[PDB]
Amino acid sequence: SYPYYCEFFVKFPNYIPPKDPAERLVDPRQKLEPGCTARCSLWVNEYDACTKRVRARTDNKGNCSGQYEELHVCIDRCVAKDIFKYLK
Amino acid sequence: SVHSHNIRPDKHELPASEVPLYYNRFDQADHPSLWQLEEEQQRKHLDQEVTDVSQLVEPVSSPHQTEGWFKRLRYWHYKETAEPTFPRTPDLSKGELAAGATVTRTSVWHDPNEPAIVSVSRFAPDNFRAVGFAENVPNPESTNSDSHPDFREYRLGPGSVDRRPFVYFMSASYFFITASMMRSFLCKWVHYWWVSRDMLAAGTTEVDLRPIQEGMTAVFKWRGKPVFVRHRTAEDIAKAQADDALIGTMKDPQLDSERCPRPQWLINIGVCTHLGCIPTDGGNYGGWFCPCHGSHYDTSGRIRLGPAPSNLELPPTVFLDDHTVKLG
Amino acid sequence: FMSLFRAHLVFYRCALNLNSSYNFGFLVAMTFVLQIITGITLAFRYTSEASCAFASVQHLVREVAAGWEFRMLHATTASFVFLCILIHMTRGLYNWSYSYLTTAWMSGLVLYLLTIATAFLGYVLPWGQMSFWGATVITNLLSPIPYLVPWLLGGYYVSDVTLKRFFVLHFILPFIGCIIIVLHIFYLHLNGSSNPAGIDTALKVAFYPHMLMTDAKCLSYLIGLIFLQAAFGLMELSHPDNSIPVNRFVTPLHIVPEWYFLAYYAVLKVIPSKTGGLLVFMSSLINLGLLSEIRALNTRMLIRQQFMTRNVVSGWVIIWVYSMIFLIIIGSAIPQATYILYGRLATILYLTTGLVLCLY
Amino acid sequence: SYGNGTVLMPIVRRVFIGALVGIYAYAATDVVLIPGYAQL
Amino acid sequence: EKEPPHPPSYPFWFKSLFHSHDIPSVRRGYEVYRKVCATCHSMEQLHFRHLVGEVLPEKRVKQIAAEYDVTDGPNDQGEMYTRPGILGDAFPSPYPNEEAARYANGGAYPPDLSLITAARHFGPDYLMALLGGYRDPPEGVELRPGLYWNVWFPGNAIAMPPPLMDEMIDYEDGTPCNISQMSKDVVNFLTWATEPTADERKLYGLKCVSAIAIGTVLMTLWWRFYWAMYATRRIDFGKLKYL
Amino acid sequence: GAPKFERKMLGSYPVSPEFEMVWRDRLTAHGGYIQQTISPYQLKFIYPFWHTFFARCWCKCSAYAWPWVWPGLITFGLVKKMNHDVEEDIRDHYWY
Amino acid sequence: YLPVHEQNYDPFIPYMAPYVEEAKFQLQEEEELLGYHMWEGVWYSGGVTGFGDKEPGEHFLVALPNLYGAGGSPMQA
Amino acid sequence: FLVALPNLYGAGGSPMQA
Amino acid sequence: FKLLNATKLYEYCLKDNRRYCMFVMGVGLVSSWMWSEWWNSVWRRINKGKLYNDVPYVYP
Amino acid sequence: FCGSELLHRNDDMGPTAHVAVGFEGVPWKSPDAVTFMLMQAIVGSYRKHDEGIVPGKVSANATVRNVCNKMTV
Ligand SMILES: CCCCCCCCCCCCCCCCCC(=O)OC[C@H](COP(=O)([O-])OCC(O)COP(=O)([O-])OC[C@@H](COC(=O)CCCCCCCCCCCCCCCCC)OC(=O)CCCCCCCCCCCCCCCCC)OC(=O)CCCCCCCCCCCCCCCCC
Ligand SMILES: CCCCCCCCCCCCCCCCCC(=O)OC[C@H](COP(=O)([O-])OCC(O)COP(=O)([O-])OC[C@@H](COC(=O)CCCCCCCCCCCCCCCCC)OC(=O)CCCCCCCCCCCCCCCCC)OC(=O)CCCCCCCCCCCCCCCCC
Ligand SMILES: CCCCCCCCCCCCCCCCCC(=O)OC[C@H](COP(=O)([O-])OCC(O)COP(=O)([O-])OC[C@@H](COC(=O)CCCCCCCCCCCCCCCCC)OC(=O)CCCCCCCCCCCCCCCCC)OC(=O)CCCCCCCCCCCCCCCCC
Ligand SMILES: CCCCCCCCCCCCCCCCCC(=O)OC[C@H](COP(=O)([O-])OCC[N+](C)(C)C)OC(=O)CCCCCCCCCCCCCCCCC
Ligand code: HEC
Ligand code: HEM
Ligand code: HEM
Ligand SMILES: COc1cc2[nH]c(C)c(-c3ccc(Oc4ccc(OC(F)(F)F)cc4)cc3)c(=O)c2cc1Cl
Ligand SMILES: O=C1C(O)=C([C@H]2CC[C@H](c3ccc(Cl)cc3)CC2)C(=O)c2ccccc21
Ligand code: FES
């Protein structure tokens, strides 16, 4: 019914100026992604494990969509903290 | 009242002469007046001091009484399962109770040494009192405990202010907030019946006049109402101008030249000024005639006869070209 | 009728120790009156046509002065109707009010049935996906009898005819409500209210000055809270999926009724036989009805004190409440084996703890 | 009881107890026993 | 089937209780919508009337409406015709019926966006996440042609192509264009379009709730005023104790 | 309502309609009593509430501990264990 | 709470028993000697429904006994 | 009219018998 | 309380119920409008540079 | 002057109830003393047993008149 629901105690960022007027012709997400990639390493570990085991089992059925989904949900939930500091 | 009793025989619940749920030891007096004496000779537990919950006297009755599946409450006293024809005889040697049925349908009250009329007199329900009665049964002196505060520590005494202003200010404040809110509600509810924000009634239009022929009336749509454009003949013009000599007599006097800035072109809002019907072609003055109550208009738009109070209303208009007009 | 007004709402004498838990009846009545006002003013602009009902409700919000306010007050006050009713019921399960307020308790049950019917009829009128498929489900649920369902529908499937008659029925039922409320209060004041202590007492006090002000205070709180939720939207009381136009050949991928219907939904998820499903509702309502004459089911003389304070055993009503909340939780979730397993556990608890109230 | 006007709630009592016995019998037949006889 | 994940909470300016919408973002979101998303979606409930005074000045809105041909009639001959749009007309749509829309989009139907954030869970956070969500398939999964993998769409496979591309559009205030920025601005615009009466609603709410709370304090005091006279009463049995 | 032996009046003046409920619920004052009240304009009325706050709150909270909280804790437990079971199922059934 | 020195008594003394037993006797004999049949009456007359009640207007279909006047009370007849 | 219906329970009565 | 009693608001405006009603109505009338304009100003103060008026459109 | 009640409830002394109500007055020397002496007379008195020659139901004193016509008895 409502377009959205109110959230308490939200923190609203101040617009960090780009150091070069050209600096944000490239997506700011690229500058936040590495750190979060490093923080979600356990999901990378498990995804690579499942990849190996699927490639090995040889009965010709298997996939690792679960762990992949978890990996990217982790990375996104990390990126969401700082992305709005770089957008007007 | 609307409530029944439930005195009936029952096979899950034996009668109280058989299995009483209360503690069945009672003292008995020869005359209830004697119960006075004991109240001024016994000791009482509430006359004596204790300080901790662990010192409170322990109940005489046993915890272990009622049993069965899903029975939370384990202790009860009274039941209304019905008595048989021949009840179980109370044993007075054990101080068991004798009451109602067990007096009427039993030999319990019999004594060898005493007349029967004297003997029965001791078995009214006032002659029996439980064991522990004088020692445990409370009889308050007040609803207030001396360990709690009553009005004496809250009363505003000599030297105090008057508080009527404050009380009535409090309630007046409540009421004026209340009234503001109520007025807001009614205003919103009224406003909700008003016309919607999509309508707006705005607009303007233009008309090309080349195709029209003399003596013809064309009709167009404008701001929700009809508009007549007529290319009058010379005789229509003459009819309109001949009645300028009788302007004295009209209900809404006006001269033709105002209504036809270009004499051969007549323009009006196509609506009866009486109650909103649309006049038809004709009438007595070669103009228009309204069928709803019979008003007549002339070849210029003027009200000549009938209940309508004014001439046909002129729309805000301009001739853009020799052959084109603008409405609105 | 003024003399009656004075006898029942001014000079009527209550017990001194009636705390807030005895104020919720007045509250449900007030939500009724308020819901009636907003109802009538919504009817003036609603369209009862399957082709255009949805856009009719959107027109109020978009193009009408204060259009949004009445729709949202009407939507949100329903939740408070049901919340207040449930508090009001649980109070009297807790106190064993039905021991002597026999016909009042029966009348109560009838009013609750009326309210369920009224709400569900309302729920179809905005005519979105959830409305259409909800109507489909509940009409299929009462199928056991031939031809009754096409007759009540009006048609072989949910249709504009169905909308028209649902609209008229939703118009009418609340007022029948009001009549039954008068009947309710007759039975009540025939007897007189109970105490929280469950004793009989002579320390009575009149209504107008003392209890009327508590009624007013709680009324202020409730008006407050309704407006808070209505204007700002703190809680997601209603699911988003009624915002989508109807499609007769595609269901919504996730389904969640209004909260006051979730427990029922949970049952329909976990019992295998459909008739068993329906019979659970019938049986539980019959059990509640049976409490009206609990004095007869035993020959021990009854008391109203349930001694639930400080009690490690708790009480069957509390277990009932927690079971019902658990069922709401499971209602909300997807169909999966483990949810169904704990569902069946909770369902058995909910049924048993209702049966057992009669066994004193 | 004699001298009382409540005459229609007793009937409803007996009907309700009846109906519950009914419903539970049928539910035991429907939900448990008939499947059980496929597992027996 | 599965429980889909829940998006993160972004700090959109509006989701506070005291904040309005952020109108420059709304302007930019409208520009994005016109240049991109209006290629396949529709907003049948919106009319240009809605933009004047709330988002844009009237003159500019008239000039926007003039860019479209809108069908009208019948005329004197009973034929239909086309004219330049006016302030009173609804937004145009790319397809004449649902069947054509499905025919152009490989069978799937692009939903009408007039209420989109109120028609999904977590609304704008879900939409913001979805527009970020496109990724390569995981090991052991392959999707048939004209279907894409997205980590936030339920069941992970979606028919809408990757939506955004840097400097695919341009802004008039000067702000730089990139997919993240476009995401934020278009989500702002759609959230506004879902209910333009939001700010009115909230500003009225504030006054209402404040006054009602002050009310509540006053009524509490009035109730206690009468509580105290019977809470402090004395009742004696037999003889008088105190005075 | 009241038993007939309690609602029997001593007076004989006709009960006015606006007092109906008052005399349907008549009760005898066995033994009599004495009562005193002070006008609320001559009492403090927000200090007596806070003066007795701790006692009242101790009583109320003590009364509700076992009956309401302990089953609450058990139910909360059950929800947590259900979540455990589901999060293990979802991997057993669908992860290789 | 009361002070602990006010709580030093046994609450479970049966002080009503001798009277409850008598009441049971008295109310059983009336059932035996009067209530043994389903007696037949005149319907909706005298303020009572006619199916057994002896107090006026205790049931809904005999509510509102008057339309004018000042009413009255059963206890003052 | 505003003093109609003097009773809700009981048997009523008549003014002439007071 | 001494201050309030010194203003003699009770004697003149609250001791008679007709005047009580006059007071209620007029104070309502004025207070509501003051409260409204104050909340308007707050709504403009917190949202500076976000509202439509604060950031004019400049034509291309 | 304190505004309070002091009630002795007693149902074993017959059907009649006795009551007195009081307000704060003025001193002997007050200017308004005379007016008070007059107000006492404006309200006056009544006895059902002994009545003079004027029926209470037609008396010029409106308070007596209203009391004597209550419920017609
Ligand atoms: C194809 C597959 C087939 C598979 C087949 C498998 C079949 C398995 C069947 C199992 C049956 C178990 C029951 C046997 C009963 C035997 C009875 C007997 O011998 O009676 C003799 C004899 C009968 O004589 P009696 O004269 O009746 O005397 C007894 C008294 O009447 C008693 O009264 P009292 O006054 O003396 O005692 C106090 C009284 C009163 O006590 C109280 O009132 C206290 C209440 C305290 C409650 C406090 C709660 C607080 C916490 C609340 C938390 C919140 C929860 C809610 C919210 C959660 C969220 C949802 O206590 C009670 O009422 C006790 C009630 C116990 C209930 C136990 C229920 C077990 C159910 C098992 C499942 C059955 C199927 C379910 C349905 C399936 C679908 C239809 O009784 C006794 O001597 C007493 C025996 C009592 C035994 C109780 C404990 C039984 C333990 C059984 C263990 C079974 C394990 C199964 C594992 C299965 C693995 C696969
Ligand atoms: C999906 C799965 C689940 C399914 C659901 C499962 C549910 C299971 C649980 C069931 C819960 C309990 C259900 C009710 C049991 C009642 C048992 C009973 O007899 O109690 C005796 C008991 C007194 O017995 P007693 O103590 O021995 O006293 C002896 C006296 O001589 C007795 O005289 P008295 O003056 O003292 O008593 C008042 C007297 C006289 O009362 C009056 O004169 C009051 C008249 C008010 C009329 C206002 C209009 C009502 C229109 C019907 C609304 C129904 C809504 C249903 C909700 C769902 C909606 C979709 O009424 C009665 O004695 C009761 C008569 C039977 C009532 C039946 C109520 C339910 C069915 C009604 C609808 C039938 C369907 C066709 C119509 C449907 C139209 C929508 O009375 C009550 O406690 C009744 C309380 C009030 C409740 C009923 C109010 C409505 C009255 C309707 C009367 C029939 C006309 C209907 C309209 C027809 C033309 C359109
Ligand atoms: C608005 C109303 C209109 C004004 C006029 C009044 C209308 C009523 C006429 C109908 C009554 C005819 C029967 C006459 C019986 C005479 C017996 C006698 O000597 O009197 C003393 C006797 C009581 O003296 P007592 O024995 O000392 O009292 C102890 C207790 O009775 C406790 O005794 P217990 O615990 O020892 O158990 C005894 C029980 C032992 O038996 C049981 O408990 C058996 C339980 C088995 C379960 C099965 C259900 C049993 C109930 C049958 C219901 C079927 C009738 C409906 C048929 C529908 C047809 C379309 O005995 C009976 O049940 C025997 C009597 C059963 C008769 C009930 C049905 C009679 C209706 C016949 C005409 C039907 C046409 C209706 C058309 C459609 C409209 C309604 O009277 C009764 O027991 C009364 C029975 C009849 C019910 C009351 C009538 C209703 C009045 C309120 C009106 C509610 C209308 C609501 C609609 C509102 C619209 C807006
Ligand atoms: C007849 C229909 C009336 C509709 C009312 C709507 C009117 C417009 C909006 C409100 C305007 C402001 C109120 C009027 C002015 C105050 C009246 C007045 O003179 O005061 C007299 C008196 C004022 O008493 P006071 O003690 O404050 O002061 C009077 C004494 N002097 C003059 C010495 C100061 O008010 C009362 O005593 C009323 C008693 C009730 C108080 C509590 C009410 C709260 C609400 C209870 C529940 C409501 C639900 C029931 C309604 C049914 C529908 C849901
Ligand atoms: C044609 C190339 C499109 C453009 C441009 C945009 N959208 Fe669209 N959208 C399109 C299709 C064919 C579909 C169907 C997807 C499916 O799986 O069936 C969609 C779907 C959406 C949705 C629905 C998401 C959901 O969870 O249901 C949304 C919210 C959506 N699209 C938004 C959206 C936005 C914001 C766009 C502008 C950036 C946009 N779409 C452009 C087709 C096309
Ligand atoms: C107890 C009384 C009532 C209850 C509980 C109730 C309940 C409801 C509910 C839950 C809705 C759904 C609204 C939504 O989903 O947005 C609704 C809608 C509606 N109700 Fe009722 N209602 C009541 C009384 C009335 C009355 C008396 C009327 C008219 C006389 C009425 C007319 C309507 C209308 C027209 C709608 C459609 C709302 C819309 O389309 O947005 N209601 N009602
Ligand atoms: C529209 C629905 C209802 C309304 C308007 C309503 C109204 C009222 C009111 C005003 C009271 C007296 C004051 C109070 O208790 O708050 C009351 C008491 C009561 N109600 Fe309800 N009620 C409704 C529903 C119900 C339901 C659903 C039940 C039972 C299932 C019920 C049973 C009772 C009982 C037992 C009492 C008296 C309890 C006691 O005196 O101890 N009512 N009702
Ligand atoms: C805190 O403790 C209590 C609070 C209480 N609150 C209230 C509101 C009442 C009450 C309700 C209605 C009524 O008469 C009416 C019937 C029906 C109508 O019709 C309708 F629909 F409500 F408008 C209106 C009016 C008379 C009295 C009580 O008895 C009551 C009793 C207790 Cl113990
Ligand atoms: O699958 C269901 C479903 O099972 C119900 C149910 C919920 C419980 C309702 C209900 C049950 C019992 C009573 Cl007494 C009243 C209402 C009936 C409809 C819905 O409300 C629903 C709505 C939209 C789509 C699907 C569904
Ligand atoms: S409306 Fe034209 S004459 Fe009356």
Numbering used by the authors:
A (entry chain F): 2 to 89
B (entry chain c): 160 to 487
C (entry chain A): 9 to 368
D (entry chain L): 53 to 92
E (entry chain B): 156 to 398
F (entry chain H): 27 to 122
G (entry chain G): 118 to 194
H (entry chain g): 177 to 194
Original paper wording:
CIII (cytochrome bc1 complex) plays a crucial role in electron transfer and proton pumping. The pumping of protons into the cristae lumen occurs via the Q-cycle, which involves sequential ubiquinol oxidation and ubiquinone reduction. Both reactions occur in specific quinone binding sites within the cytochrome b (Cyt-b) subunit, called Qo (oxidation) and Qi (reduction), which are essential for catalytic activity. Likewise, in the apicomplexan mETC, complex III2 (CIII) is the primary target for antiparasitic drugs.
